[PDB]
């Protein structure tokens, strides 16, 4: 099935200042108390990042992927449920799908034919308490395939109702010679609408040998075709640059703080 969810009012995006985030391990080599420096595609400090917010509010536009993108979102009830990566997103060329809805972190690499506004429909909105994927509108066709990955199945919790956000989700996407390196860090925070203040490292979660061309990307939003209610969710998008950084490794060994060379 395939339905256009244009249940959104035309609102321009917003901006917030990326203070100290977007710092990830440049290599798989351990150091301790070393003031090592490295050059790599990095997000410069104190950068306006495009701000999105889901509330009714269904801001799901297509965003370009020019030279790496840093993503973050303060998450509650696991609203965000996947991402889309590719270069054409019309089954003409190769495309990437990453989905972590409730059970599987499934990654598939096929020339999928998507909807105009792809998503995953979740049933049982304001009735008997449950949340399960009813409308599978992410793609329609699976013409040819080249790769797939499946993590161990699980059962995450999609329940809760609180007055403030309790979980932060960070993810870094970049393709160097076709390797979709993933750097993530989850931090339990207590804020309302602002990006957390502080510094955190980004461990390499997974690195994939996909080796496909990528230009633009999209995210997944979870929910008779029209009309439903969404919770309060926001996320940000930042862009990396070829900027040299200084990295501090504590005596035990991990990134303690980072110093942007060309900031000031």
């Amino acid at each position: 099935q395939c339905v256009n969810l244009t249940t959104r009012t035309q609102l321009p995006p917003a901006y917030t200042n990326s203070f100290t985030r977007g710092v990830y391990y440049p290599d798989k080599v351990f150091r301790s108390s070393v003031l090592h420096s490295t050059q790599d595609l990095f997000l410069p400090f104190f950068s306006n990042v495009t701000w999105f917010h889901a509330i009714k509010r269904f801001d799901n536009p297509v965003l370009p992927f020019n030279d790496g993108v840093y993503f973050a979102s303060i998450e509650k009830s696991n609203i965000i449920r996947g991402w889309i990566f590719g270069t054409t997103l019309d089954s003409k060329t190769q495309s990437l799908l990453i989905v972590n809805n409730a059970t599987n972190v499934v990654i598939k690499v096929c020339e999928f034919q998507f909807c105009n506004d792809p998503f995953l429909g979740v049933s049982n909105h304001k009735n008997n308490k449950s949340w399960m994927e009813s409308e599978f509108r992410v793609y329609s066709s699976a013409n040819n395939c080249t790769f797939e990955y499946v993590s161990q199945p699980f059962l995450m919790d999609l329940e809760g109702k609180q007055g403030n956000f309790k979980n932060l989700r960070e993810f870094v996407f970049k393709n160097i010679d076709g390797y979709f390196k993933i750097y993530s860090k989850h931090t339990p925070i207590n804020l309302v609408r602002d990006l957390p203040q502080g510094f955190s490292a980004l461990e390499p979660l997974v690195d994939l040998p996909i080796g496909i061309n990528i230009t633009r990307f999209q995210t997944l939003l979870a929910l008779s075709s029209s009309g439903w209610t969404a919770g309060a969710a926001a996320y940000y998008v930042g862009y990396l640059q070829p900027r040299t950084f200084l990295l501090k490794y504590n005596e035990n060994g991990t990134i303690t703080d980072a110093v942007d060379c060309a900031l000031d």
Binding site: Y25, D27, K28, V29, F30, R31, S32, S33, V34, H36, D177, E203, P204, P209, G211, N252, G253, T254
Partner: protein
């Protein structure tokens, strides 16, 4: 040591003084190799006996991982024509661990094999397939007129004939859009200065040497930046700790003593380094402990001798070495902050210095 100091002073008599010589070293007691518990064989058999090779303009790249490889069969096989390596030694492939393995499948004209090498030039090396300047690996090819070439003409091995610009290493294009080589813009499927970007190899068994199709395989890999996934046919041996050994971890050679490490390695980290940016801690591929690495003691050998005429007895000093090292010759041993001392009788009653030693010690000749 008397002969050594004579040799290093270039005289058959040496004055009463302390002279340096060749520095002491602890030889490695044995050799140990550490490899992961991998036993399944790499699919090089199917890689090199694949029935159909993709057209070079759409050359197929296949990944190979988590397997055991033996490139010796390919090296020694006479069925192959040109096995030229560029970053590694062909016989030295078989004692190294590789992070990732690329298999590139494509068939070109035999006369065009020279253009596959890194840094080459030509229409094929520009917009069919190419290598970076720093290619690490080998190239292998062999004639295939016996099977690929057909009497009716093996025209199915297409390739790009036109391109706007020279593409990048390991970059492929599939779109067959009509090329607007001429000044005028163009569309449609044909036209003057509107040329199809493809033209096809014509392969028949009747063609002479050099023009026949060659089944070409290009092997690409990277070393020492990622955890080992493909390793050679070397067999792991039992680990020996706190002894000077010629250790080998996934190809990372070295020389020193291996000890257990208290540094907390994250699961993705396997290579540890110091402020010197040189390996000092490695995770054993067999079991996931952390092994500290340190080269066992080496120090200067400063011979302490009186005048040659006065005496021939000599006291050998090992600079900055604990006496728990080399024995006697090449029951009278002393420890100094400057190092271990052999051949001297330590005494408590003091005199004026004659031969400086280190950390306030001085040697002298007396009953």
């Amino acid at each position: 040591p008397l002969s050594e100091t004579k040799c290093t002073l270039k005289s058959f008599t040496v004055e009463k003084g302390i002279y340096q010589t060749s520095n002491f070293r602890v030889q490695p007691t044995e050799s140990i190799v550490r490899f992961p518990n991998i036993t399944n064989l790499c699919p090089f058999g199917e890689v090199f006996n694949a029935t159909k090779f993709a057209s070079v303009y759409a050359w197929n790249r296949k990944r190979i991982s988590n397997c055991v490889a033996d490139y010796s069969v390919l090296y020694n096989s006479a069925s192959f024509s040109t096995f030229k390596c560029y970053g590694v030694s062909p016989t030295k492939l078989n004692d190294l661990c590789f992070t990732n393995v690329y298999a590139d499948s494509f068939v070109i004209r035999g006369d065009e094999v020279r253009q596959i090498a890194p840094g080459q030039t030509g229409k094929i090396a520009d917009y069919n397939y190419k290598l970076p300047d720093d290619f690490t690996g080998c190239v292998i090819a062999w004639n295939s007129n016996n099977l690929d070439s057909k009497v009716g003409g093996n025209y199915n091995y297409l390739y790009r004939l036109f391109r706007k610009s020279n593409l990048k290493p390991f970059e492929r294009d599939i779109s067959t859009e009509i090329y607007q080589a001429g000044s005028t813009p163009c569309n449609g499927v044909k036209g003057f200065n509107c040329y199809f970007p493809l033209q096809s190899y014509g392969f028949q068994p009747t063609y002479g040497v050099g023009y026949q199709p060659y089944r070409v395989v290009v092997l690409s890999f990277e070393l020492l930046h990622a955890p080992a996934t493909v390793c050679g046919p070397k067999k792991s041996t039992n680990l020996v700790k706190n002894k000077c050994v010629n250790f080998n971890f996934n190809g990372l050679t070295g020389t020193g003593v291996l000890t257990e490490s208290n540094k907390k390695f994250l699961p993705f980290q396997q290579f540890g380094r110091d402020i010197a940016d040189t390996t000092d801690a490695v995770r054993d591929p067999q079991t996931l402990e952390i092994l500290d690495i340190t080269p066992c003691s080496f120090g200067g050998v400063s011979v302490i001798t009186p005048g040659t005429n006065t005496s021939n007895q000599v006291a050998v000093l090992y600079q900055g070495v604990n006496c728990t090292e080399v024995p006697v010759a090449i029951s009278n041993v002393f420890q100094t902050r400057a190092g271990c001392l052999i051949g001297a009788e330590h005494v408590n009653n003091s005199y004026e210095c004659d031969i400086p030693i280190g950390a306030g010690i001085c040697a002298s000749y007396q009953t």
